Symmetry: D2
Subunit: 453 residues, 4 copies
């Protein structure tokens, strides 16, 4: 058994922690200032009362910034703490601010207000990462390296093509982030307990004061939905997936075995006895964070699944979940930007990784251009790799006489095929790795970034 | 090892991509003929052959073996059986890596249209019933406890706006689905200066991928579609919970048609909400697919690998499940019967104690005082063995002299509900406004 | 930035005591290996006992400078004993310390969870034994199906929780496998005595392979997994009581300690406690999904990914510990409303029993059901209830009916039919209570 | 539509046999309870075996007209025995049939999975015993750290998998708990002998409470949960080998059976199989997530939600079964490249062993490390490797260096230091091999 009485403190430690509640103090102060003005317009508050109210709130605002706004366990949430503090410096008048207002609408409002601001910060860091990748791609556009499929060397490609693939994926995340922002800016304040505000409050005034793009259409939905939370986290999860893959790419490319890249000392750790060993601690951290964010997505969906269309304590889990995601995402984008802007590419090791064999497909494409069918062209180049293989040499060292025995279509210009530059220049069609396509990609991305305003 | 095949995508799943893989092949062939890889003559045979295979596929007689491992290979073999050597030319500069991403997107493009239609139909149904039953008033809840009177229509409209946000999200996803990746080759792009713009046109796509590595290795469109489908299901799982509770005999607010429930001969009162329970459980099935694909993509190289293969089964399950659920949901909403009398009885006098407080507020009394006062009234009535709706004006004057003769208008479930005229409330004028706005958004979609 | 990207200090500080305890065992083993002299061991042992003393007054600190608790313990020793403290790190790695400390912490955490789990189960069985005579409606698809004992309902949850309890016990034995002495990856290069480490730390065994011991987090995964299913069970119990506590059903009423109200609505008792419990299932599942994704597809060695295990498992233990105590309070203080349970017991609920009666009279089930259905229909048309039909009425349906059919219309006789093991008969419920008390006797 | 949302035929068919057996057992209990005559029992049993031998040639057609396998079997029983078939349903419910059948099926499925898991484990240990002499670089953060025996690596996986085997065993105990005889929800009302049902079905025990037996799906969650952790382990092994079979690393080469190549790129060996194994971990995880979400927040009784358990758990058993066989084949047919592993061991990786040398000579570890650090730095400046330093050079750094310091530059000596239990020393690896062989044999 367990008989505590009519309180049981243990259930209090299951609610949002005070450190979390404090994060919403400012947005709750702004929301209340807007509501106060609306009340005066509805003749609930006199101009005199409004002035004492707005003054008191401003004072509390200053206290929050100084981090001296005290909150007790008895104040179960920041909304209560703020009302207590107002009564403390203004007196009874303070109680009139809650006329027709419910805690049910405060929490959703405050959370949306906080995210509107957070998305902006996230967005800023996202674009920096994209700009960093596109610009580095434009600078190292002459670098050529091996491209992979199934982590096996397939053919030569431009290192810039690799960087641009990530930039393009992150641009889609950017686009999704922008779409989510439009739905977060829908103000739910003025929905009361469930049926809406009963005092003919002017919600358009609330929207204007709070700088929101619109107001909620239905009071029941405004109070019980947490779509904005789910989307944001969902969008943040796919973004983290992208970064987890880049982290994987660089971890492999930074191995001594591959030796394509080297991380700055700022984003790695080493051993005093093994001065060559450079641990990609930063990338491993990024990769693992994809799991932390996904975990918040799974949690919130499970929380919402199957509960009635109304307000219930269940919804309380949204605060910790989103704050963790925004803080994680924010710190992660900054670290990623650092890693990419300060890493060093080893052009030497990249070329040396490009062996002649990687050009056997170009050898068949050559025949195809001479009119020969792909099937026949393929088998032809196959005999070439077999011949050189027997002659203990590479294909680029096969005389025009050796090739001539395979097919009469092999002219003198066949020597042009054995060039990593000619190889990559074949892909001029939109999206390919030719210097011209890469340049066009960089231009289109620059334009997209600009359109992120 | 034969078991390797067992872990591969099932044949019944591969057959689902026959039509789109064929359309993608015809467009490609037209592009090869322009790049002079195919003669005008070769183009005709190929196109004619693909049309024949397209016909067999529609009659369900296009056979595929385990040896063909995917539908792409089965299509090529069949073309060769119909046209001969010429068929091979169709795969010049093309890669298996780009065919699958193109086929899924082409298929998904069609699927979304279907889903959207049924989504819109479900929303229109809710909006339309809301208009018809705008005068019904039931108890409103918080924590599943009666809080205050509210209009049933306000309830229906809440689910309606949530669903419109899903509708809006589906539209945004579609824009990224229609980006053509065909022409990216194996990884570095197409090596024969193919005209990707032609492909785009021949395939009714809105644009073409900017980077070949990305276009071949990304599955954002898959995870994005499933995420949207998941939130949508969460909404339906919430609607199912509401209706299951409202359809209990204890609550008795609604009754499902025989079409969406089961019963017993020995118990006529018993009407099991099978359809609702089914809908609720599908939220988990769809979520499962979301979690599956996310875990598959986490931490793997930015290129092509066999891990990607899991996408096909996962998205078809989601689209098939979503399509069926939407129709069943529309059915349930269309044929359910509401029990006005029961909604009526549930509205007890005590539920107006708050309006009694707002009455004093409008008269100038501070909100704090009003609540206390109203709390005195609710207690006075207890110590009288009567409800508050029938307290003498003398009994009220003792609480506060502000109580006038017009205080009798508060004891009306209709006057209660009519207080909420601000945008979004239960007042008739407000509910009507919501209906008009949703009715238009529907049109604009 | 790492200021919010690294493991929090509040979590690191919780590993203080076990890290000290682990360091003391290592020191003793280092002395046996001759790396430490009898005198050096005393100095180190002495300082560590001092750091433990400080940690007993929330004194020991940390700063962003101190990446982890392992580093803070080392710093504190040095600046309290001298360079001698640096000898303690001989052949020891952080890789093995973190995985060792965590296992040491969870070992005591499981015992705490276990103690609270059993209190809940004990509370449910003892209550069932006291209210064994209460009869209420049983449901399927949330629709009334037949009469059932309320205790049978309480016991269904108690037996589910015992499977959880049993699983916690199985996880426990894999947690107490000491990984200390695995070095950076290939093991301890100083021929350290791992058996001395095990006994000092009071563990049941030691790891077999150094690579595995350093890179596996199975124990974290199965602990959270067991916790997740247990939470799924509490989420279902929460749904049941939320439904039963509505005014419409009115079977239960929560105490004021687990409910929220209002002055304007005295009849409104919000089941906050049950709503919180239900959402925590999501919270715990969230920790499961996260760790599983962190582990998926990474190389079989140490990497910074593993760092996420600490926060996730502690949130789970803290949540679980609080939730179980809250669950116990709700179950021991709630009130059942027998009057409402009885009133929900209507005659038609006995139509199935009317069929069994005929079956016992030799009639095949299929026909007995059609016969009972007719009786039901006949009662409706006459505007009465099945129990008001006359024997002549019943004989018109089947001459097999007799005067003893009147025994069928008793809610008590109805539940007393289910004497088969596990049924709702009083004798059956009594057997469940006895067996569960028996199982609870496992320490 | 309402039906295209119900489990598929091929899924329901998987339950034909176990449903048949459960019905025979119920019939016998009925007769004993005096509901069936000694004669009627014979009719029903004979008709059930006929359907059993019928599902033998796959002659039973679910028809899709039947909502589930239980219904199909009841309809098909009447079709050849007459109205007597209907008496089989006395006091029985569909609610208890579905859970009973699922458990009966999983009891046998676990056996199959178990068989393949052990074969995999045995393959790893036996190969570890055969290639015990091969040495390779060890990694942390995917950076070379120190020399290590390749067999130490293989064994780390075998030990992880032995933990999965143990968990599989504990789950079996709870799956063999018979729920038949629980009725619709209150239990069986005809005083049927459940003990008879248990022995007739070869189960370990019977459920204690009818409400729990009907609405719980713990056995489903547990199995998938165990299967998920097992797949996580295999996803890591896939990651290891994918990196090791890379050209850049070149330590491992897969057989043609588990890889794909190119006629143009004879060097191309795509690790298709491993990539396949890595993605199934997500597939299985998805089933776990789906079921946990289906069960969360629903009442403690029977409802349609519960029907999602069938497809999920079967997809999991089929996947595990296949994946383990493929995993076994990869491990048994792969080839290691001793030259590449060997030539990857650089002298630099022994700098730590140099520090240990001094520690064994009585020098404090911290000082011992700064010393090797100077040797490491001195070697660089001179443009030579650490193993090429002369006694003279070393002795200036510290007099504790002697001529025996030359032994330190042996990858063999290096790995032979870890003689403590669980280490890479040859005698430790062998000890591990012996323990697992006995642990595998214990499986009886």
């Amino acid at each position: 058994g367990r008989f505590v009485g009519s309180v049981d403190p243990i259930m209090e430690i299951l609610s949002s922690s005070i450190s979390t509640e404090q994060r919403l103090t400012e947005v709750d102060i702004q929301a209340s200032m807007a509501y106060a003005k609306a009340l005066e317009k509805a003749s609930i508050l006199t101009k005199t009362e409004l002035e004492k109210i707005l003054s008191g709130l401003e004072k509390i605002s200053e206290e929050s910034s100084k981090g001296v706004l005290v909150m007790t366990q008895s104040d179960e949430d920041i909304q209560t703490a703020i009302e207590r503090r107002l009564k403390e410096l203004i007196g009874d008048i303070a109680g009139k601010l809650q006329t027709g207002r419910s805690r049910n609408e405060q929490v959703v409002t405050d959370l949306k207000l906080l995210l509107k601001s957070s998305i902006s910060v996230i967005s800023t860091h996202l674009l920096q990462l994209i700009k960093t990748l596109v610009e580095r791609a434009a600078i190292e556009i002459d670098i050529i390296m091996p491209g992979y499929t199934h982590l096996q060397k397939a053919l030569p490609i431009r290192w810039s093509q690799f960087l641009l693939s990530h930039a393009v994926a992150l641009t889609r995340d950017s686009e999704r982030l922008g779409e989510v922002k439009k739905r977060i800016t829908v103000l739910p304040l003025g929905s009361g307990v469930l049926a809406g505000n009963p005092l003919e409050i002017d919600r358009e005034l609330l929207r204007s004061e709070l700088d929101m793009t619109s107001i909620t259409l239905n009071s029941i939905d405004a109070i019980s939905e947490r779509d904005f939370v789910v989307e944001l986290i969902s969008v943040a999860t796919l973004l983290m997936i992208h970064l987890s893959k880049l982290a994987e790419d660089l971890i492999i490319f930074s191995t001594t075995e591959f030796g394509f890249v080297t991380l700055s000392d700022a984003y790695s750790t080493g051993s005093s006895l093994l001065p060559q060993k450079k641990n990609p601690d930063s990338l491993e951290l990024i990769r693992s964070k994809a799991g932390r964010v996904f975990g918040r997505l799974a949690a919130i969906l499970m929380v919402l699944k199957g509960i009635p269309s109304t307000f219930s304590k269940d919804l309380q889990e949204d605060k910790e979940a989103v704050l963790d995601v925004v803080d994680t995402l924010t710190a992660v984008l900054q670290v990623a930007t650092g890693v990419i802007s300060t890493l060093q590419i080893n052009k030497e090791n990249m070329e040396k990784a490009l062996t002649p064999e990687l050009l056997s497909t170009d050898l068949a494409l050559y025949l195809v251009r001479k009119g020969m069918p792909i099937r026949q062209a393929q088998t032809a180049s196959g005999k070439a790799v077999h011949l050189a293989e027997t002659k203990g040499i590479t294909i680029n060292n096969l005389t025009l006489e050796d090739l001539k025995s395979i097919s009469p279509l092999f002219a003198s210009d066949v020597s042009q095929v054995f060039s990593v530059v000619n190889s990559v220049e074949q892909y001029t069609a939109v999206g390919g790795t030719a210097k011209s396509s890469v340049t066009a990609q960089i231009e289109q991305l620059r334009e997209l970034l600009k359109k992120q305003k």
